[PDB]
Design a protein around this nucleic acid. Structure first.
Ligand SMILES: [Ca+2]
Ligand SMILES: [Ca+2]
Length: 293
DNA sequence: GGGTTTCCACTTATTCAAACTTTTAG
DNA sequence: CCTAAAAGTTTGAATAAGTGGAAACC
């Protein structure tokens, strides 16, 4: 358990790493032929188990378990504890397209609260909700409820509510790089990025205006597209990016990366990145951050 | 119970984060 | 000539999302 987490930071982290789930399972023992499970979950590398424990003690709900050999998950499916999930995201709402999945999570909750999921009509309604939730219905499930079921939902278009949301979100999707551009041989270039699918291009473009710096570049890995918000101008990094996250502390192992990233920022501010000894200090910091930690 | 809920082990991609090099700006 | 800033490239894996199995619970 230990340290508690700021609710807006938590909402930002959920916008990045969270996921809502609605299981509609074939069940011979169910009077209606199907059983259900509803909840919310976060899966992270083992190195960030403390985040899941901090979230757990912030809400006082959820179960932590291994997720393979290198990951760990927090899952909330106990029905009464879903009220906590609902109460949090009502007070601290999501702003990515995942908000649409939360809204469906709510509809499914209402059905199950009335116990309608134990009847034919309630299961049917849960199939309709799941058709729009995340990756939708399997072919088997779709064929089991023969009816014109829409897969579309309202697109979410909301603005960053505050710097705390950005800290939680950046704690998930952010990246702090000490780029060693290979005449001392090396030009140290600090880089800050935030990655996200094109489905939230509106949100990504606002980062430029919201933070007053940076560029947007599109990426394409075969049939997959995503956006990268990138800042490299030192003064923007020193005056606009660093103070934001100094004032709104990151969580997880990435905080150490930001801290080291700030050490190099101070060396650069003092021109020591142009000295042989200063450069050696920077190369040593870089080796022990991000994947090298 | 007998139907239902909750938990635990584990899988599967792709959307991420991350690392690297080349060119242009001032 | 020099350092900074920006454009550019590449991809592994930590994510997001999910399933099987069954103990536990009402
Ligand atoms: Ca995400
Ligand atoms: Ca992350």
């Amino acid at each position: 358990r230990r340290e508690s987490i700021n609710p807006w930071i938590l909402t930002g982290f959920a916008d990045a790493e969270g996921s809502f789930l609605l299981r509609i399972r074939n069940n011979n023992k169910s009077s209606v032929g199907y059983s259900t499970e509803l909840g919310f979950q976060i899966t992270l590398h083992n190195k960030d188990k403390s985040i899941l424990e901090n979230i757990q003690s912030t809400w006082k709900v959820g179960v932590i378990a291994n997720s393979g050999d290198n990951a760990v998950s927090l899952k909330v499916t106990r029905f009464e504890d879903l009220k906590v999930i609902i109460d949090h995201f009502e007070k601290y709402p999501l702003i990515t397209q995942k908000l649409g999945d939360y809204k469906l999570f709510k509809q499914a909750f209402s059905v199950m609260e009335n116990k309608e999921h134990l009847k034919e009509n309630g299961i049917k309604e849960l199939v309709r909700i799941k058709a729009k939730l995340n990756w939708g219905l399997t072919d088997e499930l779709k064929k089991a409820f023969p009816e014109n079921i829409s897969k579309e939902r309202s697109l979410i278009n909301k603005n960053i509510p505050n710097f705390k949301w950005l800290a939680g979100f950046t704690s998930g999707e952010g990246h702090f790089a000490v780029n060693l551009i290979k005449k001392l041989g090396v030009q140290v270039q600090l880089r800050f990025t935030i990655t996200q699918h094109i489905k939230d291009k509106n949100l990504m473009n606002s980062l430029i205006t919201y933070l007053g710096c940076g560029y947007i570049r599109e990426f394409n890995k075969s049939e997959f597209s995503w956006l990268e918000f990138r800042v490299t101008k030192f003064s923007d990094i020193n005056d606009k990016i660093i103070p934001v996250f100094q004032e709104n502390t990151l969580i997880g192992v990435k905080l150490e990366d930001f801290e080291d990233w700030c050490k190099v920022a101070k060396l650069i501010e003092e021109k020591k990145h142009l000295t042989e000894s200063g450069l050696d200090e920077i190369k040593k910091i870089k080796l022990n951050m991000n994947k090298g930690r």
